[PDB]
């Protein structure tokens, strides 16, 4: 049922972009138990700031100290600059832009494919990001709703990509008629 | 449907990963090659799994007293010259 | 640090560090009471923590770390595949 | 018979004197009432003249030294916690996932979704291809490859085959490691107490433990002292065996605070239904005692030091 | 062919012995049954070894 397919894809793209951005921006990625601003208390650590709670001075928090064998250096660098989560956000943005431009400058039916490629790539970037984040954390604990927002963004993004590709296939099918 | 170079590479890769095949040789020569590659794969993958198990099992099991120190003469041990430690050893009556 | 050594086994003998005074000292009687009072108050434990723990510079399932490499190879491959397809 | 009786034997031997072994009717080691200024048990006996020496498991402390002369400790110890050793664990439903960590399973699922989507995209996106791999069939191919099972369709394109190859390698490493780690498995404190009010803990009525908690100022011990002084019924007991039975007869709902030596002895004696947990709150030692002005005080110190150097006390302990 | 009772018994036995397939379910319901049987087989065979 074309037409509702476009609305579903547009809504999905916006949702995935928003979820991934919120996940990167927010800092509830890991409920660890460590030192707040420089006694060990819980903390809602995130991608940038290890933030404190249930403490003498809960709510006062700082910037995680990423740095204290080139392999460890490279991984620490890639995890310090969340290049992968950030790249996921940029890709989702460009995908949405292409989907939107699919109304203007129509008849190209070649840009919506670009949208699908962007969404799929965003998902792959998101998974690499999760792997590096978990791997670096290994240098009790738990994961917060930011982590799961990132994961949900991955799933929605992949679905929106599959829909985009399906639409591109349908367009070329109609054209071949 | 026949073994060209690309299909040949796909058959071999798949046989190494034990991941089944969409097509298999039908001639005597093709079957000889296939059988030998199958044997090589069985021995090599079984060995990968067996040695990984050995790596993990051994680490999960890891000389630690005075008698073991006295027995080992290669290792040298000493104390402060003037201290309760030297006096304790000098006045001791335990064998080690 | 440098944390270049380790302890092996347990304690061969048990003893204790003890303040000392000459025979007949006027300080001997009060130092005992001072030690007992500090032990009860917990002051010695605070000093111990400050000078030992505060100077700190030092089977089970498998973890994403033991296999992360295979995940990296997988994603890299997915990327190469998409590139080859788009090139064609 | 026992350790203290032997110890008194060698102490009398070195000193040369004689001894007559006597028990206290009150069955208490000793303490003082802050109001009556009265001494109970062994300390009351020695101070009030009923005896002259205590070769016993008496604990040293500031208050008792003010009235009597102790020796150098003949064995070291510390307060500790005794609980009803919990029962062993049963494997558990959903234990078939234990060989791999939660994160590995989660990322396996995410990768399954990704591999499937990429195979669907590459297989059917170019109009020049229009490959039986739709999104449903792509997902089936990937699941079946992970479980090392039948294929029934195999990618024919170059790009589809790249995706398939990497998924195959990934599957081999992950499944091999699940099986290997299965083998591995198949072939091999106070704060938590203070936080839990459901679990009940108590101490001997008249002893260094109760006094140490009463005179304490630390947060955890202060909370414990308030709880004990308010925990009805009285968690305090009159004898060590009383606490032993209470822990052994409370289904793990009672804890006993006592010296580490007794825990070591009990856990090493059947029925072996209790355990020592965590570490020692305070460190002290058992010390022979004598009343002020006894002639035995000076030589008993030397006897204890000589036994320690000779290694006799270690042999008696063993 | 499609899964009659005889062919279905064969599909299951072959899956347990990890010895590949000649057919596989094509419908959603069939694929759910097949999936759980595949998982069951993996856990049980791995545990035997």
Author numbering:
A (entry chain E): 5 to 42, 55 to 84, 92 to 162, 173 to 210
B (entry chain A): 569 to 630, 633 to 666
C (entry chain A): 716 to 773, 784 to 813
D (entry chain D): 422 to 551, 569 to 626, 635 to 764
E (entry chain C): 569 to 617
What is the paper's account of this structure, in its own sentences?
AMPA glutamate receptors (AMPARs), the primary mediators of excitatory neurotransmission in the brain, are either GluA2 subunit-containing and thus Ca2+-impermeable, or GluA2-lacking and Ca2+-permeable. AMPA glutamate receptors (AMPARs) mediate rapid signalling throughout the brain, and orchestrate various forms of synaptic plasticity that underlie learning. These cation channels assemble in various combinations from four core subunits, GluA1–4, with each contributing unique gating kinetics, trafficking and subsynaptic localization. AMPARs exhibit a modular architecture with a two-layer extracellular region connected to the transmembrane ion channel (transmembrane domain, TMD). The ion channel is encircled by diverse auxiliary subunits, modulating receptor gating kinetics, pharmacology and ion flux, with the transmembrane AMPAR regulatory proteins (TARPs γ2, γ3, γ4, γ5, γ7, γ8) being the most abundant.
A GluA2 mutant (F231A) increasing NTD dynamics phenocopies this behaviour, and exhibits reduced synaptic responses, reflecting the anchoring function of the AMPAR NTD at the synapse. The Phe231 to alanine mutation, which destabilizes this interface, slowed desensitization recovery of GluA2(F231A), both in the absence and presence of TARPs (γ2 and γ3). The role of B/D NTD interface stability in this transformation is supported by a desensitized (R/G-edited) GluA2(F231A) structure. The NTD dimers of the mutant receptor also transit into parallel O-shape conformations, and the LBDs depart from two-fold symmetry, which again is coupled to an increase of non-domain-swapped receptors (relative to the resting-state receptor). Rotations are larger for one of the two LBD dimers (C/B versus A/D), and movement of the B/D subunits is less pronounced than in GluA1, perhaps due to subunit-selective contacts between the NTD and LBD tiers. Transition into non-swapped LBD dimers probably involves relaxation of the critical M3 gating linkers of the B/D subunits, as observed in an NTD-deleted NMDAR structure, thereby entering non-conducting (‘deeply desensitized’) conformations. Closer analysis of the three sets of desensitized structures reveals a gradual transition of the LBD tier into four-fold symmetry, which is greatest for GluA1 and smallest for the edited GluA2 mutant: GluA1 > GluA2(F231A)-Arg743 > GluA2(F231A)-Gly743.
